[PDB]
Write an enzyme that holds these catalytic residues in place. Structure first.
Site, short mmCIF file in Angstrom:
data_model
loop_
_atom_site.label_atom_id
_atom_site.label_comp_id
_atom_site.label_asym_id
_atom_site.label_seq_id
_atom_site.Cartn_x
_atom_site.Cartn_y
_atom_site.Cartn_z
N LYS A 94 -73.74 120.31 33.75
CA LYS A 94 -73.72 121.57 33.00
C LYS A 94 -75.14 122.08 32.77
O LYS A 94 -76.12 121.35 32.95
CB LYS A 94 -72.98 121.41 31.67
CG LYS A 94 -73.56 120.35 30.75
CD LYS A 94 -74.78 120.83 30.00
CE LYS A 94 -75.47 119.68 29.31
NZ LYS A 94 -76.79 120.11 28.73
N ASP A 120 -71.94 115.74 24.17
CA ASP A 120 -71.82 116.57 25.36
C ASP A 120 -70.62 116.17 26.20
O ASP A 120 -70.15 116.97 27.00
CB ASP A 120 -73.10 116.50 26.21
CG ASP A 120 -74.27 117.24 25.57
OD1 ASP A 120 -74.08 118.40 25.14
OD2 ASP A 120 -75.38 116.66 25.50
#
Ligand SMILES: Nc1ccn([C@@H]2O[C@H](CNC(=O)Cc3nc4ccccc4[nH]3)[C@@H](O)[C@H]2O)c(=O)n1
Ligand SMILES: [Br-]
Ligand SMILES: [Br-]
Ligand SMILES: [Br-]
Ligand SMILES: [Br-]
Ligand SMILES: [Br-]
Length: 270
Positions: A11, A132
Site C-alpha cells: 500500500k 496496518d
C-alpha cells in the site's frame, strides 16, 4: 504439495496526519490507505510450520510466523504449513509489506482449515500485531482512523501513472514517531477536510508529517525527494518512509540515478 501461490500487495499512504499521543505510547492518526499493484509472491505448502523469505528475516521475527503461532494458540489447531515469501516489497519502505504478508497468509490458512475464525476475529488476530495489517483484509482504498485499524472503505477519483522510488535505507517507523513534537499535530477537522479533497482526486492536497521527519532522520530519503522535484514532479512520502512516490512515469535519467544509487523504481498504474 499441495503448493499454492498467493499474492501479497503493498500500500501507499495518500496523506497522513497525527492528532496526538495515546497513553499506549502510540499515536492517533488519520490516513488514506491505497492498495497498489505491487506484490510479494507467497508460496504455501503442506509441511512443518516454517516461514522463510529470500532476504533473510529470522523466522521468530517474521510477522507471519508470529501470526500463525497465535492462530494455534487462539484456536487450538496445529498449523502444518511451509511458507516461503519472495520479498519484492522491501521492509522499511513504508509500504506495509510485512503486514500484507501477515494478513494474506493468515486469511488463507484460515480458509484452508474450514474457517475456524470469523472475519471479525481474524481482523482481531492480525490487527493486534500490526495496525496496518487489517487494511490488507479489505484492500482497495480505505480511510484509517484510530491507529489505522479503524477503517472506512472509500471510492477515490485517483488513477493513472504512479512511480515509487525506494532508497536503500530502512526507515524505522518507531524512530520517526518518536521525533514528533507538539507542532506536528493537527486537529481531526483539518485532516478530515484534507482526506476528503484527496479522495476527490486532488493529489496536491497530500501531506505527511512523518515524511517531513523521515527526511531529516534519513538524508537519502531527502535526496530522492529533491531528485523527484528536479525531475519536475511533486514528490510524496509513503508511511514513515522510506518510499517517495509521484504521479508520472520514470525517465531514463531517473532509472540511471536509481541504478547508480541503489534505488528501486516501481512504475505502477492506478
Ligand atoms: N498509529 C501508530 C502506529 C504506529 N506507531 C509506532 O509504530 C511502531 C510500530 N511499527 C513498527 O515497528 C514498524 C517498523 N519498525 C521498524 C524498525 C526498523 C526498521 C523497520 C521498521 N518498521 C510502534 O512501536 C509505535 O511506536 C504509532 O505511534 N502510532
Ligand atoms: Br516454495
Ligand atoms: Br510532543
Ligand atoms: Br540515510
Ligand atoms: Br535540503
Ligand atoms: Br507527502
Amino acid at each position: 504439495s499441495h503448493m499454492i501461490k498467493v499474492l501479497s500487495p503493498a500500500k501507499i499512504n495518500l496523506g497522513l496526519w497525527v492528532l496526538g499521543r495515546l497513553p499506549s505510547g502510540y499515536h492517533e492518526i488519520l490516513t488514506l490507505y491505497q492498495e497498489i499493484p505491487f506484490y510479494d509472491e507467497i508460496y504455501i505448502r503442506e509441511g512443518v510450520l516454517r516461514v522463510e523469505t529470500n532476504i533473510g528475516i529470522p523466522q521468530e521475527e517474521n510477522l507471519v510466523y508470529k501470526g500463525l503461532r497465535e492462530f494455534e494458540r487462539i484456536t487450538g489447531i496445529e498449523i502444518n504449513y511451509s511458507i516461503f515469501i519472495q520479498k519484492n516489497i522491501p521492509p522499511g519502505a513504508g509500504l506495509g509489506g510485512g503486514s500484507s504478508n501477515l494478513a494474506v497468509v493468515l486469511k488463507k490458512v484460515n480458509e484452508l482449515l474450514g474457517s475456524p475464525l470469523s472475519e471479525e476475529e481474524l481482523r482481531e488476530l492480525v490487527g493486534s500485531i500490526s495496525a496496518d495489517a487489517p487494511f490488507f483484509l479489505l484492500g482497495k482504498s480505505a480511510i484509517g482512523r484510530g491507529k489505522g485499524e479503524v477503517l472506512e472503505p472509500v471510492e477515490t477519483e485517483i488513477s493513472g501513472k504512479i512511480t515509487l522510488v525506494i532508497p536503500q535505507v530502512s526507515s524505522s517507523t518507531g524512530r520517526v514517531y518518536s521525533s514528533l513534537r507538539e507542532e506536528h499535530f493537527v486537529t481531526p477537522e483539518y485532516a478530515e477536510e484534507k482526506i476528503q479533497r484527496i479522495i476527490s482526486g486532488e493529489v496536491e492536497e497530500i501531506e505527511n508529517v512523518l515524511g517531513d521527519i523521515a527526511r531529516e532522520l534519513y538524508p537519502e530519503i531527502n535526496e530522492v525527494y529533491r531528485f523527484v522535484e528536479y525531475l519536475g514532479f511533486k514528490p510524496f512520502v509513503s508511511g514513515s518512509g522510506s518510499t517517495v512516490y509521484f504521479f508520472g512515469g520514470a525517465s531514463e535519467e531517473l532509472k540511471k540515478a536509481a541504478k547508480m544509487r541503489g534505488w528501486k523504481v516501481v512504475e505502477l498504474e492506478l
